[PDB]
Design a protein around this ligand. Structure first.
Ligand code: TSD
Length: 123
């Protein structure tokens, strides 16, 4: 699965749902800054939340409850093409959960869950 399909799918899959988040606090942790933030260059402190808003939008983040089940469902279509490619991202999220271990602070949970997502899947 080309990265071009990864960012295009995850985005188009919730495009009308991602625009409200960026407007929620101010800006999108992505356009926040090309590559001058930290984790991936977009953001980190505000990323673990501004971008985490898209998570709670699909019933994956309940205040401080970091889940992944709803994601396991979108990874199915979001990663159309191969059967294992979907099975790969599945295990990837696991490394992000064991790392974020459901922190107390919202931005903290996301910052940890986002970081790992960039290290393994990059997106
Ligand atoms: C919500 Si969620 C799957 C972490 C999103 C991703 C990107 O695309 O960035």
């Amino acid at each position: 699965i080309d990265q071009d399909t990864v960012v295009a799918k995850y985005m188009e899959y919730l495009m009308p749902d991602i625009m409200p988040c960026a407007d929620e606090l101010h800006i999108s942790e992505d356009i926040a800054t090309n590559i001058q933030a930290a984790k991936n260059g977009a953001d980190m402190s505000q990323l673990g939340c501004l971008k985490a808003c898209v998570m709670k939008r699909i019933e994956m983040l309940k205040g401080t409850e970091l889940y992944v089940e709803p994601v396991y469902k979108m990874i199915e279509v979001v990663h159309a093409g191969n059967a294992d490619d979907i099975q790969l991202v599945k295990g990837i999220a696991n490394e992000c959960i064991e790392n974020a271990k459901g922190e107390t602070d919202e931005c903290n949970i996301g910052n940890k869950y986002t970081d790992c997502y960039i290290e393994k899947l990059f997106s």
